[PDB]
Design a binder for these strands. Structure first.
Lengths: 363, 1094, 251
DNA sequence: CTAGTTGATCTCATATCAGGAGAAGGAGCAGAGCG
């Protein structure tokens, strides 16, 4: 590493080299945090986490008990040991608390003054973070499994919602219009994710073992349907062209948005060319998941790319483009529901059914 | 909010890219050199390089390629900036005026994308059908050129190979074909695609992928007769044309990797190849009838470590170095009897990577003097930089009240100035100065009872003298006075002027024109003007005949610089100057382009105008205020051109470089008079008269910054000055290969005395690290203490600790073994320099690399890998831990002011630590919680902490319940340089404080604090100059200085780009008037001049 | 010539005839074409919608932007105005081949041959709504480029056979010309917007529950003030939702 | 050939406790029998 510093000082290597190499080295040295703790407030398992995209300081967490906790991750104390204190809380005494489990919570991109939370109580609530009051509510005829706002859209502010209905709802923040729907799936839509690269590209994964990419501006259904075999087993499109041999319960675009990682209940993760949906045939081995709802997993950013997938009661870290298994982060006592990656310091926060949020820091 | 003023003391000198072509004209051969933000356009003459233009981009020039579209007469220049401003520039010369017009421009940044590892590649189709840009992984950006854009609308083609090493456009292809080496997990392969501009996608290339060397890193597209590509790898050079596959593995290129290449010929039968060691190879393609028969590589010789190299013509190669001085070398057909055909013709100074520096008030003056660890591996050196011309005096004669100096050739045969005439109050004094001997003698033909207003050598092997009463034309060869002219009314002469042919004398309000002829003084033109005369000059410029056709005068009570028609003494032009002080000096001089008229007042004001040989009309008035005393201007022809010396209480050498007037200081006390002198012993020497004596010195170069060079031949790393010992401690590093062997005699291996580290604490090519003690007068390596095997000396501090009186050199080291990523071992060694030897006074084995040390109130503050600890120096002379702080990723940079410690982290960016002395432990005052990767830190005030981010940004944090622990970045600024060092001090004798900084490219910049009043005024001017000055790539200044990182971008704030402000003097009056719409302009000249003085 | 954003040129002599609002409509139609979305030229009766469509198609074929320029388009209009469309096309853009699929017609052979000829010749097939219902087997096998429906409010009944027939065209470029694209209730608006852009207003049950009951029930005389405000809320939502795809200029 | 008249037929649109008996399945236990 002194070689890295010397090369940076002498201009031999771009500082990009040291930055990304050290980010990768930090991610590889991920371990149970020696001096860090997260305050425990959820009475039930944490189903979702979200660190705000700008300044990466505050973290939302939705629990199976319906409460939403807002933590400050910064060590505002002077000690080397600190607990990520809870700033705010939609608790059981809040007038607008979710009646059932919160399954997805997401900070509004471009601004930390608002966030959103969807629950199995058939509601997507939009909260003002300052007053901590519901600015808007979007009711659905069937329970919400996931939702996502575009991390890129300066123009549109649509929330793509996947419920147990076979339709992907698009709730417009502007002129409150939840009527827009996308047809083409056949069972519950367990995951939805906007492309970080393209403004109007949305990937949706449903229990019909299919993943569809939509240009929501378009009037002609999905753009691409992901196919495991790319055409080896080709059939008229009524039941073929499946992404997995089970329910596809997790989506994650890579950092650049040029590839898509789909995890399904066939104990398989697959990497897809996001421009034509071709399977890249990256192996990843066997990725154990049996979750009946959406599975939240994230990818690394700003490194020389990693994907952190909940794997039983562990976090499996894989190399996205080679599939090589890095490691198992092993500190949870029950199945891990979500993991969210802090890209500023290569940190990880994992929420599981054991009512714990565990922080993994580079050693 | 904080108010800071950043300015460039030394422009970047490291050459990141150079191309050659016909840019300035269809017939000229240009060498365009990109230094980081400066673009230098040269013309390749038969000898050397004649600069024509130097423009400053608002951008780091990442790509630079010359291309000739169909129909274009001369090359256009494509520039891509690091911030991805693309522009196509054309050179349009309109007579005297030179412009760089932006034929097109745009911004090609994709909103997201992984910037590619190998870096920005920009290639152009040889038929100029498109520009390919590889900026990000997985994409290949295409800018079509047949479609004449003005916005360079660019489109991405998804490139399925995500790690492309290098790419070129192949030659002789029906369609634009790229050939690239890319890395996939199975190895490196060379693949080809054809780019289809209409389908906006790739198509199958002419020749299939080929599996190549593991480190194949360079692709050379070979011109049309051959076509195909040459892939240079670490160990082999391979050639591909689709069916032909030649390969050679010359052992001679195995020692180092080839990093730059260049095609010597137009048909590519020969290529120059530069490697990281500085060797220069010639790759030859031997043809057969046409196909290619075989490849050869031969080692031409050695150069500076080339970043880029260009073949100009006639064997002349420009070697562009980022790490050393760039070179202009020659390729001889035959060896120099030592195996090398390379012969260095010229060397261009490069303050290479300035890795550390100190400002030492060496010479015990009041002026700082930077001493920089510049350069790198073979090119390492210490550069000593000062803002002075450098009198370099050789003799003196204590003669008081010398009001006149003129060089004389008393010996007829000699053309040398071997005599000097002097006027003091009322008489004339001659000095012989034969060789080095100086004496006071009398020369025939001169009156010692009347003062000498002027005298000099003239044509016809004649001398001439203008005294207060008459003029005496001395016939040097035959005898004493034979032609003498006396004013008919016996009125005294008030002012005189003369040249090699003619004369113009002022008597009262009247002017007389005399022409010197053999044994004759003929009066022709005469007049009695409006007011008294003040100053005159008739020096012919671009004479070519023997006579000057113009005249310059200064008058009284109508303070103005007038021009006259010599044969008739009519009034040609008038520029009104004003004031209550009469003009004192008027001179007309050629400054690199044309004729300028320099007129000065008695208050140090000085006006330079652009004069014409036909009308005599002064244009582009610009005024500059030098000195607080009267000035006189004397002309001396140096090696290059004429340079004028403003003689005053602030003597200044005013010359022009790069077609602009830049003023160089001379740092002696005062200079009343000067005259040039070239005696048999004194070449191109001066003769500076002051009130007391006559100092006889030469001036080396007049470049504003004088740069000495102390070649170390090894990479220096740190430098600290020990005044009591009169030496610099310099940590150096040399690369030895095998037990081990030095590849060359470095300064460490050639010390007076030496020593080796014998420590009991810890029990290819490797870096040997030494502590060099360097004499601060002669800069010879007095001592070289070599450190342990596998020990990296990182930090070095000079200080005295505790209570003992000795001054110590304290070195912090780390143990580097290839099996590890972070040193776990390291030590702090305390040395004392005495009796020319370096004894080891103490040691302290620590458990990490000691990245930084600062002496902290008599205690030693070191930063071991992630812990910052304070050591006490016990009476026992050992270091004892006192307190620690552990809350860091890696404390790389430490600074101090009082009880506060600024810790720059590798990536948490600053933490204001306070050593609370009553308790004896550290306390985190505040922290900046942004993830800025630091390169240096500094403390400006009690509450301002400057930091340099690794993305070429400067930011200022300011000490702001728990939100009081958040330092606020109140200043943001994209510098465009990778700052390596901040240091308090200034190179010179409104603004508060002064922090110098050195960069990787060789910029030396200077940060200073402004007040709110000044800051507001200058920010408003900055906005208006952006509204007025037109940038080369039509880049916005605000965009250029916007704080930029891959995850953040903000407009600058709290920072004044002093460069943009100081460009306010380089604009003509109408544009200036536009700038200052809403107080008067001369007021802002006061401000900007006062700012440039810092 | 008039040059629009990317590659669309409409001839100068043709452009000059059009009024300001008509060429604004041509601009809007081509923005829809770029978006590959349908629309409703809601300009009232007499403002000129045949001319706007003719000019836009003329500029689309002229601009040379599967289909090079203009493909085979089908115009469904009431029986009384088929020859009107023929006359307007002939006078405004005579280069187009404009055949009528009707008993009156001009062909004098098997109709299916006429549809085949127009499909393979990239001509304009003007037909009636009754024929679209009757010949839905043949009319949708040919990959038409434009399915302009003149007086497309005939599609207002979502369950009528004509509506189900007209909603079989695969192309995205669906245009309705009707100066009154709402006549009895919001179900009609849903039917039309299902034709031009199937997704915006969701499934008919959802559209009913979200818009029809709130907006309609707040217009009754006995509406409570809160219910009136809810209807206002829903009407504003719907107006914002349908703004980009409805171009309705008044007289 | 070839247009105009005549009937049939379809679509679409206009509001407001005092049974009993037997057969088929599944359930739980019990044991036998073999790896």
């Amino acid at each position: 590493m002194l070689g890295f510093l010397s090369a940076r000082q002498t201009g031999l290597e771009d500082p990009l080299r040291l930055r990304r190499a050290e980010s990768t080295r930090r991610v590889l040295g991920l371990e149970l945090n020696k001096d860090r703790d997260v305050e425990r407030i959820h009475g039930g398992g944490i189903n979702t986490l979200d660190i705000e995209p700008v300044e990466g300081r505050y973290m939302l967490s939705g629990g199976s008990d319906g409460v939403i906790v807002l933590y400050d991750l910064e060590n505002s104390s002077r000690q080397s040991y600190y607990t990520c204190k809870a700033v705010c809380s939609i608790g059981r005494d809040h007038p607008d608390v979710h009646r059932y489990s919160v399954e997805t919570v997401q900070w509004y991109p471009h601004d930390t003054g608002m966030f959103t939370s969807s629950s199995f109580d058939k509601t997507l609530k939009v909260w003002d973070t300052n007053t901590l009051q519901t600015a808007d509510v979007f009711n659905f005829e069937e329970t919400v499994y996931s939702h996502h706002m575009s991390p890129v859209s300066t123009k549109h502010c649509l929330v793509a919602v996947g419920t147990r209905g076979p339709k992907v709802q698009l709730c417009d923040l502007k002129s409150g219009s939840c009527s827009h729907i996308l047809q083409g799936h056949r069972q519950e839509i367990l995951a939805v994710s906007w492309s970080p690269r393209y403004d109007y590209i949305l990937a949706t994964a449903s229990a019909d073992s299919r993943v569809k990419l939509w240009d929501v501006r378009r009037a002609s259904g999905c753009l691409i349907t992901l196919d495991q075999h790319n055409g080896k087993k080709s059939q008229a499109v009524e039941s073929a062209n499946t992404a997995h041999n089970g329910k596809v319960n997790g989506l994650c675009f890579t950092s650049d948005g040029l590839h898509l990682l789909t995890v399904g209940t066939d104990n398989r993760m697959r990497l897809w060319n996001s421009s034509n949906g071709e399977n890249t045939l990256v192996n990843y081995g066997k990725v154990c998941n049996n979750s009946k709802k959406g599975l939240k997993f994230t990818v690394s950013c700003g490194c020389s790319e990693f994907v952190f997938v909940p794997y039983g009661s562990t976090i499996a870290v894989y190399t996205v483009y080679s599939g090589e298994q890095i490691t198992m982060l092993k500190g949870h006592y029950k199945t891990v529901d979500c993991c969210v990656f802090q890209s500023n310091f290569q940190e990880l926060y994992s929420g599981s059914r054991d009512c714990n949020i565990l922080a993994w820091v580079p050693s | 909010m904080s108010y800071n003023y950043v300015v460039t003391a030394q422009k970047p000198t490291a050459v990141n890219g150079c191309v050659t072509g016909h840019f300035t004209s269809a017939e000229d051969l240009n060498l365009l050199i990109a230094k980081n933000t400066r673009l230098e356009i040269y013309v390749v003459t038969a000898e050397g390089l004649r600069p024509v233009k130097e423009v400053g981009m608002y951008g780091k020039i990442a790509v630079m390629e010359l291309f000739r579209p169909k129909g274009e007469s001369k090359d256009l220049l494509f520039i891509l900036t690091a911030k991805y401003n693309a522009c196509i520039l054309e050179y349009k010369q309109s007579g005297e005026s030179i412009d760089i017009i932006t034929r097109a421009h745009g911004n090609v940044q994709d909103r997201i994308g992984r910037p590619s590892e190998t870096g920005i590649i920009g290639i152009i189709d040889p038929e100029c059908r498109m520009i390919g840009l590889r900026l990000y992984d997985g994409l290949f950006k295409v800018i079509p050129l047949d479609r004449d854009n003005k916005e360079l609308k660019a489109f991405n083609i998804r490139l399925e190979e995500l790690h492309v090493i290098d790419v070129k456009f192949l030659y002789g292809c029906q369609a634009p074909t790229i050939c690239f080496v890319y890395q996939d997990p199975q190895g490196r392969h060379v693949k080809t695609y054809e780019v289809s501009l209409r389908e906006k996608e790739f198509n199958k290339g002419p020749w299939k992928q080929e599996n190549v060397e593991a480190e194949a890193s360079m692709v050379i597209a070979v011109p049309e007769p051959f076509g195909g590509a040459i892939i240079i790898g670490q160990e082999s050079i391979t050639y591909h044309n689709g069916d032909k596959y030649l390969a050679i593995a010359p052992p001679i290129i195995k020692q180092s990797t080839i990093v730059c290449h260049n095609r010597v010929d137009p048909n590519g039968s020969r290529y120059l190849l530069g490697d990281m060691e500085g060797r220069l190879f010639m790759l030859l393609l031997e043809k057969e009838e046409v196909t290619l028969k075989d490849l050869r590589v031969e080692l031409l010789g050695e150069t500076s470590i080339a970043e880029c190299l260009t073949y100009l013509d006639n064997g002349v190669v420009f070697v562009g170095s980022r790490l050393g001085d760039s070179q202009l070398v020659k390729l001889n057909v035959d060896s120099n009897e030592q195996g090398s055909y390379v012969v260095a013709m010229e060397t261009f100074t490069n303050l290479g990577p300035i890795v550390d520096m100190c400002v030492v008030d060496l010479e015990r003056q009041g002026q700082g003097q930077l001493v920089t660890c510049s350069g790198a591996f073979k090119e390492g050196s210490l550069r000593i930089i000062r803002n002075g011309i450098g009198i370099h005096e050789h003799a003196s004669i204590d003669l008081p009240g010398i009001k006149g100096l003129w060089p004389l050739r008393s010996d007829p045969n000699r053309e040398t100035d071997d005599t000097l005439v002097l006027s003091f109050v009322g008489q004339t004094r001659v000095l012989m100065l034969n060789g080095e001997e100086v004496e006071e003698t009398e020369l025939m033909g001169f009156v010692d009872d009347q003062q000498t207003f002027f005298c000099g050598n003239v044509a016809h092997q004649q001398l001439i003298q203008i005294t207060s009463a008459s003029v005496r034309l001395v016939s040097q060869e035959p005898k004493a006075l034979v032609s003498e002219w006396k004013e008919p009314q016996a009125k005294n002469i008030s002012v005189a002027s003369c040249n090699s042919s003619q004369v113009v004398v002022a008597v009262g309000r009247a002017l007389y024109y005399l022409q010197i002829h053999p044994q004759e003084l003929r009066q022709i033109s005469h007049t009695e003007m409006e007011h008294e005369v003040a100053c005159l000059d008739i020096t012919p410029l671009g004479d070519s005949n023997g006579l000057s056709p113009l005249c310059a005068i200064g008058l009284w009570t109508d303070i103005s610089a007038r021009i006259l028609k010599l044969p008739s003494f009519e009034l040609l032009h008038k520029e009104m100057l004003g004031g209550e002080i009469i003009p004192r000096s008027i001179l007309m001089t050629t400054f690199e382009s044309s004729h300028y008229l320099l007129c000065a007042l008695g208050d140090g004001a000085l006006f330079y105008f652009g004069l014409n040989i036909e009308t005599g009309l002064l244009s582009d008035r610009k005024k500059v205020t030098l000195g607080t005393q009267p000035t006189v201007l004397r002309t001396f022809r140096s090696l290059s051109t004429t340079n004028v010396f403003a003689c005053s209480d602030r003597p200044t050498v005013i010359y022009s470089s790069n077609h602009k007037l830049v003023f160089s200081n001379v740092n002696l006390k005062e200079v009343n008079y000067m005259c040039p002198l070239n005696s048999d012993g004194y070449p191109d020497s001066l003769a500076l008269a002051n009130n007391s004596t006559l100092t006889i010195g030469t001036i080396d170069e007049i470049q504003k910054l004088h740069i000495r060079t102390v070649p170390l031949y090894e990479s220096p790393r740190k430098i600290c000055y020990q005044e009591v010992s009169q030496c610099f401690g310099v940590l150096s590093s040399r690369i030895e290969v095998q037990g081990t062997t030095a590849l060359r005699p470095s300064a460490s291996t050639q010390a007076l005395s030496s020593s080796v580290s014998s420590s009991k604490l810890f029990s290819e090519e490797v870096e040997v690290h030494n502590l060099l003690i360097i004499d601060q007068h002669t800069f010879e390596v007095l001592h070289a203490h070599q450190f342990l095997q596998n020990e990296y000396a990182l930090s070095l501090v000079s200080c005295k600790l505790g209570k003992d009186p000795n001054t110590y050199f304290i070195v912090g080291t780390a143990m580097v073994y290839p099996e590890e990523a972070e040193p776990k071992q390291g030590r702090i060694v305390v040395f004392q320099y005495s009796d020319g030897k370096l004894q080891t006074v103490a040691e302290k084995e620590v458990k990490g690399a000691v990245y930084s040390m600062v002496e902290f109130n008599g205690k030693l503050l070191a930063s071991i890998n992630s812990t910052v600890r304070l050591y006490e120096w016990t009476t026992e002379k050992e270091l004892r831990t006192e307190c620690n702080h552990y809350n860091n990723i890696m404390a790389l940079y430490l600074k101090t002011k009082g009880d506060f410690i600024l810790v720059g982290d590798l990536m948490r960016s600053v933490l204001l630590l306070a050593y609370k002395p009553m308790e004896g432990n550290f306390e985190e005052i505040a922290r900046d919680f942004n993830p800025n990767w630091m390169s240096a830190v500094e403390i400006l005030d009690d509450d301002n902490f400057l930091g340099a981010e690794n993305a070429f940004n400067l930011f200022v944090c300011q000490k702001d319940d728990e939100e009081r622990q958040h330092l606020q970045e109140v200043g943001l600024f994209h510098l465009g340089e990778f700052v390596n060092v901040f240091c308090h001090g200034s190179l010179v004798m409104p603004t508060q404080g002064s922090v110098l900084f050195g960069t990787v490219n060789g910029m030396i910049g200077l940060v200073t604090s402004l007040s709110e009043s000044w800051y507001n005024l200058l920010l408003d001017m900055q906005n208006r100059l952006n509204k007025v000055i037109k940038s080369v790539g039509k880049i916005e200044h605000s965009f250029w200085r916007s704080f930029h990182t891959e995850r953040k971008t903000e407009p600058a704030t709290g920072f004044i780009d002093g460069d943009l402000i100081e460009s306010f003097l380089d604009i003509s009056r109408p544009k200036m008037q536009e700038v200052v719409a809403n107080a008067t302009a001369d007021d802002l000249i006061k401000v900007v001049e006062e700012l440039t003085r810092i | 010539d008039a040059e629009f954003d990317e590659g669309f040129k409409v001839p100068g002599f043709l452009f000059k005839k059009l009024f300001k609002y008509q060429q604004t409509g041509v601009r809007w139609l081509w923005e829809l074409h770029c978006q590959q979305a349908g629309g409703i030229l809601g300009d009232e009766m007499g403002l000129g919608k045949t001319i706007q469509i003719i000019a836009f198609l003329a500029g689309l074929s002229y601009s040379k932007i599967r289909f090079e320029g203009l493909g085979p388009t089908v115009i469904v209009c009431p029986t009384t105005v088929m020859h009107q469309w023929v006359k307007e096309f002939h006078t405004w853009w005579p280069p187009f081949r404009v055949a009528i699929l009707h008993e009156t017609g001009s062909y004098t052979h098997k109709k299916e041959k006429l549809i085949r000829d127009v499909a393979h010749c990239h001509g304009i097939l003007i037909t009636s709504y009754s024929y679209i219902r009757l010949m839905q087997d043949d009319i949708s096998r040919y990959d038409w480029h434009y399915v302009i429906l003149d007086e497309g409010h005939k599609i207002r009944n979502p369950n009528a056979a004509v509506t189900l027939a007209c909603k079989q065209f695969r192309t995205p470029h669906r245009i309705i010309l009707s100066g009154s694209p709402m006549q009895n209730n919001l179900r009609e608006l849903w039917s039309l917007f299902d034709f031009i852009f199937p997704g915006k207003l969701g499934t008919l049950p959802v559209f009913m529950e979200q818009f029809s009951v709130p907006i309609t029930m707040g217009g009754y005389s006995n509406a409570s003030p809160v219910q009136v405000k809810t209807a206002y809320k829903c009407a504003c939502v719907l107006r914002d939702t349908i703004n980009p795809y409805l171009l309705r200029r008044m007289k």
